[PDB]
Design a protein around this ligand. Structure first.
Ligand code: MG
Ligand code: MG
Ligand code: MG
Ligand code: MG
Lengths: 501, 507, 453, 496
């Protein structure tokens, strides 16, 4: 029994736990957390920790990101970036952009852990996006080492002629829906932190599925689970809440009364259930359209008003209320019993119909804000006014809440906006409190564009194409990579080699 | 015990082996192998096989590539491609180029299996390059399914308005020096075949090391291990042999008589070994000068022209050269001695480095001797060059073709070259066709993928940092739309419709 | 250098040839119990222009041939969850199938190396990667042994081992790890890594076990088959139902679940089943002949209350059968008569449906049974039609036993423990691993190198 | 231009450098480094570093390991363990053993990163063994967490009925050769540190290749390359030097003077170079006999036929040793090293005890622990090996591989088996390990149980597995709790 020992002596267990809860409570008092709500205590967090404290460089980048985005919000400016594929691209973005985005969409088509690509359905294995974050972070880390060495090796007077690129640009990545239940969310979060992420975003859709939402309660839990995992690991990982309620058409359950005001119901008492009808149509293929119309689906508020045609007094009192207390309000104002069934128009998967929109999205963001360092509302157009509506809507309740914007390529920016305004779109939005903006898929498109250009030219005229469209433009622009050996770290590793010999 | 069974019943083992050995024999009679030397039997091969025979899509692509390269060589045309970084890129390449190249260099800086990058030393883990091959090949396969579906879902009258891309462009990949001994070479070759490589290339350098060479014997075994493993897995993998002898300055050992003509020696009988001196000094370029290093033949001829007499110096010299061409040092020594040439002082041990490497004077003639040595064990050959010299490229081809006239060649359109300062634009354009006439039937820009991606990224982010969203519309989205880039309607391109018709089929 | 991949003039004829081939395939005996809700034409539409053949298919064919002859004789193949290659080379001598456990994987083989209880929150690359691990090892030791046997003279061969290492593998696909697209991606991985058959549960991912409706778990079972078709393989699909012990269900939308959904019966407040008909059809039946509420006792998550048990599980197994090559119902205890009721309930509609059984280690086999009945338990269940049986966690438990046993003894008496507790018994049993170089393939690779030089 | 900035302002670069180089020199003075030669300067090391400082759990386990082995050696005791395979095993070992070993041999047969198995030639991808380290180490961190939670979730008055296992047992693993050049070594060392390793060992073999040695200078370089990598990430990683000299017959080159005493030469002036011969013919064993190969010092004695020679010639560079003879009036000795070279180019060598000791001594200043690969449980040889290195460096930790292949039932009486580890620990062998123990234990139960289960079914699971597991108090028999079910449902409840 020479090698048997306890792992923490029982005479110190209680006394170390105290010492640690005092450190966590004192950590939680830092202004980093002044907008953050934790429905758990330091005691429950520390009692899940083990005896070996791990420190992550993720944390340092979270902090770096937090400093950046606050000066961004306080000055009503914006950091903006785009969706990076791979280390060559990240080394060039670092010269001009202070954040890095890692897209799940680009990852679905370029970076799945199983190599099986496809559309953006978050059906890649969930190591995918974190593994891409590491791919970039380890390349950032490396080029930092390479450059530092080149600088410090030369005389101070001479360093003015050398490049001084900030490669350590903090990374924000897509956690999708969280890839499962709340045990998966914490595990996913754990990978993002182990792999270098400075912040992640998570969205209120259902996984495995118009878009289908989860109840607000389910998404809050997610946001808490992320925070619960960063606490425990001791890190300042930004968490970002995305709502897909603007164009969502379905919801999994009707159990959260915050969601009631938007759930659509059939107002036709003669109609049987849709699912009953669709199944018991046993003989047929490729009728749902008419059950829909003949059911005259409405929000309950609209259904109440339409019966009335008191209305105004109804809307004022009913705002935010469950279905039961909205019926009750109405019939207390002399309104007949309205027929409102929201089971009947359920899909054959069991899902509920919803009418989303900008109002449903403000509701969800405000619900999510105590648990989210930043928010965004996916939208169908790059319309500045809708953006101001949403932002004033959220800032009515929480005027310090940071916001984030997706400058999407799913938009046709020629037929959506004049050139003079494309130029001003980030600056204006920043004025509303969108301190972080990003183009999800630029990496994909830039790459597809020059590969199409060059492979064509190269096919037609050969090595003329490499000189004219690649190697000579590189020179004139001063792109470091044209001197590829020096860029790859050949001089850095040569000095390592000699230091050892 | 009614779950206990043999594997094959002992009464059928000898028979199954005879059938297989027959199949391998018939297979090796295919014209594919008409230039192929196999220093092993079919029985030896089959004895290494198991009871479950596996079939690889790699094989399909190797067969597809072989037929392509055969057509090019005979017409003296060329297939040319470049080093592909990623699936997005590979989907664009597939439109215009019939092959794909996967680079060790690009992989070292963008694709190590450990995510740790660095200069091209082949010190990434050896899963690195095959994993990139699976990366591209699995995307090629997907985009094939997507497009076959969209096409077949439309009626014949409407299919000509639809893209019809060959996404299955065969992949050629870097295997470096094989990453260790012959067993790793076999293990490496096995990963490549499992992940979809049509062909692989391997260099005559020494791993872990002014390039250092391995002896000809050692590199020939690499090339044989490859073939011995493709045989076994029953596939038709192309094995490309690359020699770095044109620029190399060093070699691991002096044991191969085919390298004895290029190995350098000291001709100064007074000097102490360079290693003994360097150790005792705890210069070096100083010892070298006083060492007066030379290939043995030149050392022998310089003795002939310094030795009155020897009354017939030009006739002794000439005769020695013709007789010693391709001979060991020992055999060369005897011949000169048989000719009345005084004993020559020649020490090739004394200039060894502190690592124990021998010096060597490479260059084109050494590269030629190496390629001729590798040729029967290689489906294609190349010689690394220091600049795009057409003439040296022609001297190298003619040297190989003097002995093996039908030996396919490969050329590296290196971006380590300065193409503005090597060649006018009009001659830039003809270069690949010129090289194709000499039988360089496969050509490739190794790092084009890295540089194209670097260039769009440096100029799009700069603009983006400058004029925001106008940059994206100016530089990216509008040009995509004008050029008709399929990726620009990116949901369709990713297969949004293919997967939708997949889940509707199931529900 | 620009070519089209399939000329337009050959597209239709090639599509035609291929649809005819799939139909001639589906007319094979292997598919005589199998319901496909889609056509060959649809399936080919989802294929590309390069056919890939998989070793998986040979193993699926081997497994079918195995279980057919076992079911026809009311016999049984039985195995256990294998952890790891050393173990699989030892199993291969006495057991003809191999099981790969999600439970064992969650605790020892997750792709992220982060362990935890069996909640299927590991990356879905986890279990198919464990199939490859064992399979790649199987194919090796097969090549090693074939060389040794064929290197020797037939006279001396009977004195050599002759193990079937290619023992067909069955693996846990849990719930599918997502919606149907993920199921097909997951199914695609197993077929590529070498699975002979996979199994999949009617639980809900992310979650008193909670159920999915019958229709959702049929789709899982069709997505699987549809991915095997397309890839051209004969993957065996095992449907598992956790109904005997389930208490919740995600939605009420399916009419086949109505017969078991528990409703409230105190009008005062804000539990019993109603009684194969729907509820609207059930009420209409009762008032064609002369109060029931299930939205109230919903959980805070929106789940419906339900009453499981053999009745609920016979309902579900009969729904899945046309879509499944084998059925099993996970039980709380190893109860013969319960196993007789289940088999009888299913065979009363599908006499021919193969069955599977979990000889659970979650059980207490000393308490629940005597040693004589222990020896016959498998044999008896085989009479019922359970043709494939397995101990999920035997691998985990054997490894933990000998490890605790040996690490302890080795800590007390050094190398005496290694000689006494390991080496000496290894030789008395004639364990091939004791000659470790040879076992590892040292002679195989040696001859490989010698053949190259 | 609102997003561009330099990463370190030029005005702070010189100051930050100076302060970090200050931290390294302070760090290098710790007692931990008192035996350690560093052929490079703090300035050279920090010049390779980046701007972002990274802390590794490896470091903590390095420091735990060192503190364990320091005590073992002063006390002339030993830590022992064996080659662990997988997390189920490591949670069981943790109860009774204080270190964990990760084997290349086991990993080649059970854990390659490509899933392609094979005999120990270190020809798997070099991600293989660091990946196994992580496999085990992430398992240790979880069970540590799970058990801390169980214990803290219980009143103090009740904890003594609960387990208290040290799952954070420091891991030592196999770096083989380094898997190539020195850049490969640093990259491989870099992985081990990122993945959890407390220590690693590396060998003087040539990769890709009787055994073939590298020259002494080359392996020293490997060691320095490990330590430099560790000194960049700022970790106390243990570096173990293994020599394979005692059974080695080949070496790659003769360029290193310290190897000269063991390289065999030809003593026959009548013979042509072996390779010259073998080639013309395309007989070796005949040549090897007729060449009469001896190490230089023996061919010199035979010529004399002396004591003053062997006294002066020890560890000298042949060109020196030859002149040593020339000074003592000794005729021209005919020795040729290059003749007996193999067809691959390798030199012949005669290893054995005196070679391993010579190499061990040359490695020690770069090695936190030394060991000589042994094929045989000979106590007397362990003594001679130890006493030799201890003549020069008496405080060198040593390590020892306990043979799994040898027949222990006959090698030694039972009682001497019981004492073997203790007897070696008295020589300085403070860390000891059976490499393949994990493989054999798994192979023993699997054969044993699979047969019984094929024969008597479920009876065999109760009789040979479930009942003994209960009677022994194996925490795994309650598998749900052991997996950490209670730890995770408490996690979830904390959230919701
Ligand atoms: Mg996404
Ligand atoms: Mg390379
Ligand atoms: Mg499971
Ligand atoms: Mg090893």
């Amino acid at each position: 029994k020479n090698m048997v020992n306890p792992a923490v002596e029982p005479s110190m267990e209680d006394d170390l736990f105290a010492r640690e809860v005092a450190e966590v409570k004192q950590w939680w008092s830092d202004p980093r957390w002044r907008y953050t709500k934790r429905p758990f205590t330091a005691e429950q967090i520390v009692s899940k920790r083990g005896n070996l404290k791990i420190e992550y460089p993720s944390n340092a980048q979270s902090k770096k990101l937090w400093k950046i985005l606050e000066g961004r919000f306080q000055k009503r400016d914006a950091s903006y970036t785009y969706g990076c594929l791979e280390p060559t691209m990240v080394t060039q973005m670092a010269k001009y952009l202070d954040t890095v985005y890692v897209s799940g969409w680009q990852s679905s088509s370029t970076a799945s852990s199983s190599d099986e690509p496809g559309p953006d359905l978050a059906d890649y294995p969930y190591t995918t996006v974190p593994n891409k974050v590491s791919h970039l972070f380890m390349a950032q880390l490396f080029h930092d080492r390479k450059q530092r060495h080149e600088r410090l090796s030369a005389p101070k007077s001479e360093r003015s002629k050398l490049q001084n690129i900030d490669y350590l640009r903090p990374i924000i990545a897509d956690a999708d829906t969280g890839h499962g239940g709340l045990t998966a969310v914490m595990k996913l979060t754990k990978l993002f932190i182990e792999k270098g992420a400075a912040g992640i975003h998570i969205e209120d859709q259902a996984p495995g599925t118009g878009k289908v939402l989860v109840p607000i309660s389910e998404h809050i839990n997610r946001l808490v689970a992320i925070r619960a995992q960063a606490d425990i690991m001791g890190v300042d990982l930004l968490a970002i809440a995305r709502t897909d309620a603007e164009a969502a058409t379905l919801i999994t359950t009707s159990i959260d009364p915050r969601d009631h005001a938007f759930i659509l119901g059939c107002t036709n008492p003669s109609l049987q259930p849709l699912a009953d009808l669709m199944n018991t149509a046993e003989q047929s293929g490729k009728i749902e359209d008419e059950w829909m119309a003949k059911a005259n689906l409405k929000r309950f508020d609209d259904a109440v008003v339409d019966v009335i045609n008191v209305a105004a007094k109804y809307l004022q009192a009913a705002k935010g209320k469950s279905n039961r207390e909205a019926r009750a309000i109405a019939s207390s104002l002399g309104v007949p019993e309205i027929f409102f069934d929201w089971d009947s128009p359920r899909t054959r998967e069991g899902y509920f119909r919803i009418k989303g929109g900008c109002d449903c999205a403000i509701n969800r963001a405000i619900a999510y804000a105590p648990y989210a360092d930043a928010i965004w509302m996916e939208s169908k157009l790059p319309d500045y006014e809708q953006a101001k509506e949403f932002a004033e809507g959220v800032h009515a309740v929480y005027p310090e809440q940071k916001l984030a914007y997706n400058l999407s390529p799913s938009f046709n920016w020629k037929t959506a906006m004049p050139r003079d305004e494309q130029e001003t779109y980030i600056r204006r939005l920043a004025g509303l409190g969108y301190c972080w903006q990003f183009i999800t898929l630029a990496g994909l498109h830039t790459t597809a564009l020059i590969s199409d250009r060059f492979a064509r030219a190269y096919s037609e005229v050969g090595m003329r194409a490499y000189g004219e469209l690649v190697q000579e433009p590189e020179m004139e622009l001063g792109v470091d990579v044209v001197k590829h050996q020096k860029w790859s770290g050949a001089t850095y590793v040569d000095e390592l080699q000699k230091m050892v010999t």
